[PDB]
Nucleic acid binder design. Structure first.
Ligand SMILES: [Mg+2]
Ligand SMILES: [Mg+2]
Ligand SMILES: [Mg+2]
Ligand SMILES: [Mg+2]
Ligand SMILES: [Mg+2]
Ligand SMILES: [Mg+2]
Ligand SMILES: [Mg+2]
Lengths: 99, 206, 114, 100, 127, 79, 151
RNA sequence: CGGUCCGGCCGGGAACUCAAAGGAGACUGCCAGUGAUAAACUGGAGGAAGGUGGGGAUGACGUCAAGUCAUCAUGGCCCUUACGACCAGGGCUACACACGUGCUACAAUGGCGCAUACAAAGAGAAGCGACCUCGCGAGAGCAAGCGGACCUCAUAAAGUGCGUCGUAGUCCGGAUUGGAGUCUGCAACUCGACUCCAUGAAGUCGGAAUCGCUAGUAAUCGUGGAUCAGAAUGCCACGGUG
C-alpha cells in the first residue's frame, strides 16, 4: 500500500538531516518517495520566576520546539523495506511507522 | 547587576546540550529525574577521576552515557574493570539497558568544570585562594586560551566578612553569542562555609 | 391597573409592568403572559378588564408581595432560633455566604463609622 | 521540604495505586449506576473505611529533587528554580531561552 | 491566463485573480456587499480601481483568510495592486503615489512580562 | 450544596447514633464529625460537636435535620 | 520631544466627502476604538444639522467651526518661583484641533436624547455662537488679553 | 480541468493560501540641501522595508551588610522519650478600621431580543471529549474521533441589520439575602465553583492628591494556557477594531 514515516526531534538541523537519509535511501533502492513534508512545529512555552523569593516581574521565558517531518514511501519494495529497516538514525529523532 | 548564564544563553548558538534525547510530556519528567539520578551516581563515584561533562542520549529504549574525562584510565580501569561495574548500576537506575562511552579531555586546564573543581579541591587543602586563581589563569593562557576569568565568592581564607574576588586575563566578550565561552561552577565546602568558584574561558569566535 | 398585591402597574409594556410585583422577575413575567395569551410588547392601554383578571388568576399561583415577604422573613428567623452559623450571621449583620470581612463587606455592615 | 513531608507523599502514592486505582473506582462507578441499587448499596459507607491517603486528590505535586510543593511544572517534574538550574546547564533537551 | 497578485495585512491573507470584462467582485463565493457590512471597507477595495480606470473593464475573483474586517479589506487592496502590475507593470508609478504597493508591516505587539499589556505598565504607588 | 445521590454521614458516628437509640439516651456523644448531615433518627440526642479545642453539646431538634453538625459549633471566638 | 523633532501623522480622508478635517473630527469623537459607531454619530449629526440649517453639509460645519476657532492662548511658565501665563499665537493646524475638541466635549456634557442630537444642537449653538464650546474660546480669550503685558 | 448527493467532496492539479528548512535584501548605498570639503542630520528616488525598519533576548565596574538559612546547599548555635514524629478537628478565609493593586458600574458611543460577517495563539490518553438523547439550566446518560495542520475543547466578542426602551435610580447597575439544585472530591458547616427562581444595596462619573501610555501604542473587545481532583476579577500569552 504505502509506508508513512513521521519524524519528531527538538533539533531542526538533525531532523531534516536524518530525513535526508530516509529520502535518499528509499529513492536509491528504487521506491516512489513523496515529501519531505514540513508539518507545523509545536512550540511549548514556559515562564518561570528567576528569583528564589519575591521579585514577580523578574522572569525567564523558554520554549521547546517540536519539529515535524512526514516521509511517504509509495512503493514498498523488499530492496527499500530492508534498506530503511537497517538504517542508523540520530538517537534524538523519534520515528513513527504508519502502515 | 545580574548576568545571564554564559552556557544557557549560547545553547543552539555555539554550545551543545548535555541531554540530547527526545520524549513526550508523558515520560519527559521521568527521564529528567533518571538523568539527575545517573549524573549524581557517576559524579560521586568518579570524583577523583576528573569528570568534566556527562552527556545523556536515549536511543529508543536504551541509555547512552558519554563520560568526558581528563583521566580515562581510572574511569575505564583494568581492561574495562570499572566501566562494567558502572554500566551495571546505570542500567539499574535508568531501568532500560546501559552503554557507557568515554571521551578524553585533552587540555584539562582549558575545561571550565575541571579548572573550577581544581580551585575548589585546592581551597579544601588550605591553599591560598589568590595562588589557586593566578595558577588557573596562567595555565589556561599559556595553553592557548584567548581569555580567562576566575571568581571566588564568600569567606576567603576564613575571613568573617565575605568577599568576591576575581582575576581576568585576555579577552572575555560575554555579549558575543558567536564567542566560544566555556562557563562552569564548583563549591568549596570549607571549615568556615561554602566558597563558590565561577570560571569563564574564551576560546575564539564562530 | 391593579394586580394581586395592591400595587398599581404603570402604563409601560406588559413584561416590565408585571416585574413591579415583589416575587415576579423577568422569567415569571414572561411565563405569566404566555399562559394568559397576552403579547409582551403591548401596553396597559387596550388591555381591558377581561384581560387583567385572567393575569390576576395566573399570578395568584405563586407566593407574591406580603405573602412572600413573611415567607422570606420566616426562613431568616428559623435559622436565627436554630443557633446555626447562617443564623448567627443574620443576627450579627455580617456576610452569611462566606465572603471576606477583613475588607469589603459594606452591603451587609452598612456605611462605615470611625 | 522536610524528610517526613517527602515520606508522607510516598505513602500517599503507595496507597493510591493499591486501592483507588483497582478497588475504590469500582465502588464509585457503582455509586453512580442509576439502573442498579437506588437505596441499599453501602458503597459510600465502605469508601470511608478505606485509608484517607489512598485518594489521588490527596497527593501534592512536589519538586522531585528538593521537595518544593510550590512552583511545580508537570513537564519536568521540578520547581521553577531547579528547572532554571538544569535548563542553563543544557540538561533539559530542546529547551533554551525564547524570544518572539 | 489569470493575472495573479497576493496581498496581506495583519493576520489576513488575500489572493486576487484578474480577467478582463465586466465589473464583478466575488469574495469567498460571496458578493462584495454580502461579505462587508461596512461601506468604508467596501471603498478601500475600490481604491486601486480609481487611479487605474475600471467601470466594466475587468473582473476579480478574490479569496481572503485570517484577521478581521479592515485586515481582510486591507489585504485585498494590496492584492489587486499586485495583480494590476502583473497585467501592465507601467502602473507602478500611480500605485506608489497612492501607497497601495507597500505591505503594512504593523502587527500587534507581544504582551511583555511585568506589564498589563504590550506597553501598559501596572499603576505605580509611591507609598 | 451536595448531589442528591445520598446524604453524607460518618460510619463511626452513624453506629454511635444506633447504639444510643437501643441502649437509651446517655451523656453527650463526643464526636469530631462536623461534616455529617443530621438525620431524623438524631432528634432528641445530645451530640458534643468539636470546634477545634472543646466539644460543644448540641440538643438535636426536628428543624436541625438536613443541616451539618458543624453549623452548631462556632470555630472562631470573636469579642 | 526633547531631542527628536517629529512631524505629524497624515490620516486617511473622510469615506463620505473625502475631507481630512472631518477624519480628525470622527477620531476626536471616537471612543474605545469604535470608528464604525463614531462616523455613524458624526454623519447622523451632519444629516440633521444641514437639513435644519439650509443644506451645505461641509459649509454648515465650517460656520460652526469659525466661531470656536481660537486666535491666542496662554502657556504656563515658571521663571522665578512664580507661574507666569505667556500669551502665544496658536498655529492654523491646532486652531482647528482645539475647535473640534471643544465641540465634542461640550456635546458630551449636554442632556439630549442621543450623541447625534447632542452634536447637531452643539454645532447649531456654535454656528450662532451661543453655547458651551464658544464660551471655552471666550474664557481662553479673556485669559490672553489679561496677561497681554507678558507677551 | 473531468464528475456531481452542490460539501474540496472525488479523480486530479502542484498554480496559489499556508506549513518549515535553506537563501537573497537596507549599507546613508545613490541624489540634493544644511554642516569646518568631516562626522552627522534633513528631504527625495528606488524599494515590501530607510536611516539601530518593528518587537524581543542580551543588564559592564560597581551601589543598597538590599531580598532569600522556608527551594536547595552550607559555617556556627539551639532541641534531640522533643523545636522530632503520627493522627482527627480547627486556623491560615476572623473584622471597629486604614492603605496598596484590581474587577464591575453609574448607561443611549448604552441595556435587551432575534438574525448574522471576520481571528490569532494554545491545550489534550488517570486526557480533550463530538454526534444523539434527557433537563429551562448547571449538567447527566449513551458513545465516535484523536497522542492530533486530520479528532476534540470551541458558538470569538466588539461589529453589522431590524425591532424595543426614551434620560427615569430607569428594560441602567449588579451587591446582598431567601428557596431549590448541579458537579468535583473519603468529605463542599467553618471555607469551592457553577445553575434555576425570587430579591434588586451603593452608585447619576469621584475632594486634596495621583498613575499609565508616543502607534498597530493607548482605549476597548473577546480567545487560550501554566498551576490544578475542584477552586482566576490574579498572572502568563493571543489576535479583532483602533
Ligand atoms: Mg420584581
Ligand atoms: Mg532536608
Ligand atoms: Mg491538590
Ligand atoms: Mg526564512
Ligand atoms: Mg548588545
Ligand atoms: Mg440588567
Ligand atoms: Mg518611549
Amino acid at each position: 500500500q504505502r509506508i508513512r514515516i513521521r519524524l519528531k526531534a527538538f533539533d531542526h538541523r538533525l531532523i531534516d538531516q536524518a530525513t535526508a537519509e530516509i529520502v535518499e535511501t528509499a529513492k536509491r533502492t528504487g521506491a516512489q518517495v513523496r515529501g519531505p513534508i514540513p508539518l507545523p512545529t509545536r512550540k511549548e512555552r514556559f515562564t518561570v520566576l528567576i528569583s528564589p523569593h519575591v521579585n514577580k516581574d523578574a522572569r525567564d521565558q523558554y520554549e521547546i520546539r517540536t519539529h515535524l517531518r512526514l516521509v511517504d514511501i509509495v512503493e514498498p519494495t523488499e530492496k527499500t523495506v530492508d534498506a530503511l529497516m537497517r538504517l542508523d538514525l540520530a538517537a534524538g529523532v523519534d520515528v513513527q511507522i504508519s502502515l | 547587576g545580574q548576568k545571564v548564564h554564559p552556557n544557557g544563553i549560547r545553547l543552539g548558538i555555539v554550545k551543545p546540550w548535555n541531554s540530547t534525547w527526545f520524549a513526550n510530556t508523558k515520560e519527559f519528567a521521568d527521564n529528567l529525574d533518571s538523568d539527575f539520578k545517573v549524573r549524581q551516581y557517576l559524579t560521586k563515584e568518579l570524583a577523583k577521576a576528573s569528570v568534566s561533562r556527562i552527556v545523556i542520549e536515549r536511543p529508543a529504549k536504551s541509555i547512552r552515557v558519554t563520560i568526558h574525562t581528563a583521566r580515562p584510565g581510572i574511569v575505564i580501569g583494568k581492561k574495562g574493570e570499572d566501566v562494567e561495574k558502572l554500566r551495571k548500576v546505570v542500567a539499574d537506575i535508568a531501568g532500560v539497558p546501559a552503554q557507557i562511552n568515554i571521551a578524553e579531555v585533552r587540555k584539562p586546564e582549558l575545561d571550565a568544570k575541571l579548572v573550577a573543581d581544581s580551585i575548589t579541591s585546592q581551597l579544601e587543602r588550605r591553599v591560598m585562594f589568590r595562588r589557586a586563581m593566578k595558577r588557573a589563569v596562567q595555565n589556561a593562557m599559556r595553553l592557548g586560551a584567548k581569555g580567562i576569568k576566575v571568581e571566588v565568592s564568600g569567606r576567603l581564607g576564613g575571613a568573617e566578612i565575605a568577599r568576591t574576588e576575581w582575576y581576568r586575563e585576555g579577552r572575555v566578550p560575554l555579549h558575543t553569542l558567536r564567542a566560544d565561552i566555556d562557563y562552569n561552577t564548583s563549591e568549596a565546602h570549607t571549615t568556615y562555609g561554602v566558597i563558590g568558584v565561577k570560571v569563564w574561558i574564551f576560546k575564539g569566535e564562530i | 391597573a391593579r394586580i394581586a398585591g395592591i400595587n398599581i402597574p404603570d402604563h409601560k409594556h406588559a413584561v416590565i409592568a408585571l416585574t413591579s410585583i415583589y416575587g415576579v422577575g423577568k422569567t415569571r413575567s414572561k411565563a405569566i403572559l404566555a399562559a394568559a395569551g397576552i403579547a409582551e410588547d403591548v401596553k396597559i392601554s387596550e388591555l381591558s378588564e377581561g384581560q387583567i383578571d385572567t393575569l390576576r388568576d395566573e399570578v395568584a399561583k405563586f407566593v407574591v408581595e406580603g405573602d412572600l415577604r413573611r415567607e422570606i422573613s420566616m426562613s431568616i428567623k428559623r435559622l436565627m432560633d436554630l443557633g446555626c452559623y447562617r443564623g448567627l450571621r443574620h443576627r450579627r449583620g455580617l456576610p452569611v455566604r462566606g465572603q471576606r470581612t477583613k475588607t469589603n463587606a459594606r452591603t451587609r455592615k452598612g456605611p462605615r463609622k470611625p | 521540604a522536610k524528610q517526613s513531608m517527602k515520606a508522607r507523599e510516598v505513602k500517599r502514592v503507595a496507597l493510591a495505586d493499591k486501592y483507588f486505582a483497582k478497588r475504590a473506582e469500582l465502588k464509585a462507578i457503582i455509586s453512580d449506576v442509576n439502573a442498579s441499587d437506588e437505596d441499599r448499596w453501602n458503597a459510600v459507607l465502605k469508601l470511608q473505611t478505606l485509608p484517607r491517603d489512598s485518594s489521588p486528590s490527596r497527593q501534592r505535586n512536589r519538586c522531585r529533587q528538593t521537595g518544593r510543593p510550590h512552583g511545580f511544572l508537570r513537564k519536568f517534574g521540578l520547581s521553577r528554580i531547579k528547572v532554571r538550574e538544569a535548563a542553563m546547564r543544557g540538561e533539559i533537551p530542546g529547551l533554551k531561552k525564547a524570544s518572539w | 491566463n489569470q493575472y495573479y497578485g497576493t496581498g496581506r495585512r495583519k493576520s489576513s491573507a488575500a489572493r486576487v485573480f484578474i480577467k478582463p470584462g465586466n465589473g464583478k467582485i466575488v469574495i469567498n463565493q460571496r458578493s462584495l456587499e454580502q461579505y462587508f457590512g461596512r461601506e468604508t471597507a467596501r471603498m478601500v477595495v475600490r481604491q486601486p480601481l480609481e487611479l487605474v480606470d475600471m467601470v466594466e473593464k475587468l473582473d476579480l475573483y478574490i479569496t481572503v483568510k485570517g484577521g478581521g474586517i479592515s485586515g481582510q479589506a486591507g489585504a485585498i487592496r494590496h492584492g489587486i495592486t499586485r495583480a494590476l502590475m502583473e497585467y501592465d507593470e507601467s502602473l507602478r508609478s500611480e500605485l506608489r503615489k497612492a501607497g497601495f504597493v507597500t505591505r503594512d508591516a504593523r502587527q500587534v505587539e507581544r504582551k511583555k512580562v511585568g506589564l498589563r499589556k504590550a506597553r501598559r505598565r501596572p499603576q505605580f504607588s509611591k507609598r | 450544596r451536595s448531589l442528591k445521590k445520598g446524604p453524607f454521614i460518618d460510619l463511626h458516628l452513624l453506629k454511635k447514633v444506633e447504639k444510643a437509640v437501643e441502649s437509651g439516651d446517655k451523656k453527650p456523644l463526643r464526636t469530631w464529625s462536623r461534616r455529617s448531615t443530621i438525620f431524623p433518627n438524631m432528634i432528641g440526642l445530645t451530640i458534643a460537636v468539636h470546634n477545634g479545642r472543646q466539644h460543644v453539646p448540641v440538643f438535636v431538634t426536628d428543624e436541625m435535620v438536613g443541616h451539618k453538625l458543624g453549623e452548631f459549633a462556632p470555630t472562631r471566638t470573636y469579642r | 520631544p526633547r531631542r527628536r523633532v517629529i512631524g505629524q501623522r497624515k490620516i486617511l480622508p473622510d469615506p463620505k466627502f473625502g475631507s481630512e478635517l472631518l477624519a480628525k473630527f470622527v477620531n476626536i469623537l471616537m471612543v474605545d476604538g469604535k470608528k464604525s459607531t463614531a462616523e455613524s454619530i458624526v454623519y447622523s449629526a451632519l444629516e440633521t444639522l444641514a437639513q435644519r440649517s439650509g443644506k451645505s453639509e461641509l459649509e454648515a460645519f465650517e460656520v460652526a467651526l469659525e466661531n470656536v476657532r481660537p486666535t491666542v492662548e496662554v502657556k504656563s511658565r515658571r521663571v522665578g518661583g512664580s507661574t507666569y501665563q505667556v500669551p502665544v499665537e496658536v498655529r492654523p493646524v491646532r486652531r482647528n484641533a482645539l475647535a473640534m475638541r471643544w465641540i465634542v466635549e461640550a456635546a458630551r456634557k449636554r442632556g439630549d436624547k442621543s450623541m447625534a442630537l447632542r452634536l447637531a444642537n452643539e454645532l447649531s449653538d456654535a454656528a450662532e455662537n451661543k453655547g458651551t464650546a464658544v464660551k471655552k474660546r471666550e474664557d481662553v480669550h479673556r485669559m490672553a488679553e489679561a496677561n497681554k503685558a507678558f507677551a
